[PDB]
Amino acid sequence: HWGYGKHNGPEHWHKDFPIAKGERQSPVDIDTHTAKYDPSLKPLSVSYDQATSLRILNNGHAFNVEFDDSQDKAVLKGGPLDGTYRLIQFHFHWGSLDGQGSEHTVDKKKYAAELHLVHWNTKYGDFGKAVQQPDGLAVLGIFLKVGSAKPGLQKVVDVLDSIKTKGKSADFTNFDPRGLLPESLDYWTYPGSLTTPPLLECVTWIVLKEPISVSSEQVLKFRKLNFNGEGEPEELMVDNWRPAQPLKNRQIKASFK
Ligand SMILES: Cc1cc(C)c2c(c1)S(=O)(=O)NC(=O)N2
Ligand SMILES: Cc1cc(C)c2c(c1)S(=O)(=O)NC(=O)N2
Numbered sequence: 001h002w003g004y005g006k007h008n009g010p011e012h013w014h015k016d017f018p019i020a021k022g023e024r025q026s027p028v029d030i031d032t033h034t035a036k037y038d039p040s041l042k043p044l045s046v047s048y049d050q051a052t053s054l055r056i057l058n059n060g061h062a063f064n065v066e067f068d069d070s071q072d073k074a075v076l077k078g079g080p081l082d083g084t085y086r087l088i089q090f091h092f093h094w095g096s097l098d099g100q101g102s103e104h105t106v107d108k109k110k111y112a113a114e115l116h117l118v119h120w121n122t123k124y125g126d127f128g129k130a131v132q133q134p135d136g137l138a139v140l141g142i143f144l145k146v147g148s149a150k151p152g153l154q155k156v157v158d159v160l161d162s163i164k165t166k167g168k169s170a171d172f173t174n175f176d177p178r179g180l181l182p183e184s185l186d187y188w189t190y191p192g193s194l195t196t197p198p199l200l201e202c203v204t205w206i207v208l209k210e211p212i213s214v215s216s217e218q219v220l221k222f223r224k225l226n227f228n229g230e231g232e233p234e235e236l237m238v239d240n241w242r243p244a245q246p247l248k249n250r251q252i253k254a255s256f257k
């Protein structure tokens with residue numbers, strides 16, 4: 001099935017998932033001089049003080065940190081959003097080299113990695129119903145550049161040895177995602193999709209302007225994960241990013257001048 005190799009990567013996905021050539025696919029290049037400042041956009045409200053992390057999973061495409069989303073514990077509101085969106089998981093996309101790895105680009109710049117904090121619109125009752133709706137999800141995207149270490153990321157880095165291969169999971173309680181946020185919540189926003197199959201067009205993307213800095217050693221440890229399962233030939237989990245897709249009839253809005 002689908003992956004990031006030459007025979008099953010992004011250029012092949014449309015054969016099983018024809019929406020790959022759809023009208024609101026993600027990621028996109030953010031042309032900063034074409035995005036319009038929208039003074040009607042509100043500040044983001046990121047309320048993660050009560051977040052309850054549960055588990056970390058290597059799903060063969062990335063590693064996902066999963067949260068308890070059975071109550072309004074960690075929520076995203078405001079910005080372009082109507083209503084309340086509940087945090088369900090986060091994961092990253094990254095490169096084989098520091099020069100690439102992000103999915104979104106900024107004036108064609110590729111960052112070393114990109115963090116996706118995935119939230120679902122509570123009006124639909126659960127995640128499975130939400131992904132069926134054009135306003136079902138809000139994904140907060142945060143760029144990573146290589147520089148100083150991110151202290152709040154280290155607990156993630158240090159558990160990766162225990163989920164090296166596809167299908168492995170580990171307990172991952174009491175992780176505070178506030179330690180992954182930059183100082184500023186200035187953002188760009190546009191309507192898009194999941195960036196892997198099934199590529200559903202159900203996402204309000206909110207991409208922060210300010211990257212976070214992680215150390216070379218931190219991102220090097222991401223690159224030791226495996227796409228394969230245990231007992232299969234080793235294929236390093238690197239370059240698990242989809243390139244920019246056509247913007248088509250969409251406008252990217254900026255929260256900031
Ligand atoms: C607000 C809303 C609207 C529609 C059409 C819905 C739902 C909520 S729902 O609760 O997610 N389930 C469903 O099948 N259709
Ligand atoms: C809801 C969701 C599901 C999947 C598989 C996703 C994303 C969101 S995502 O945040 O668009 N990035 C990605 O690679 N896969």
Ligand SMILES: [Zn+2]
Pocket residue numbers: 091092093116195
């Ligand atoms: Zn993602």
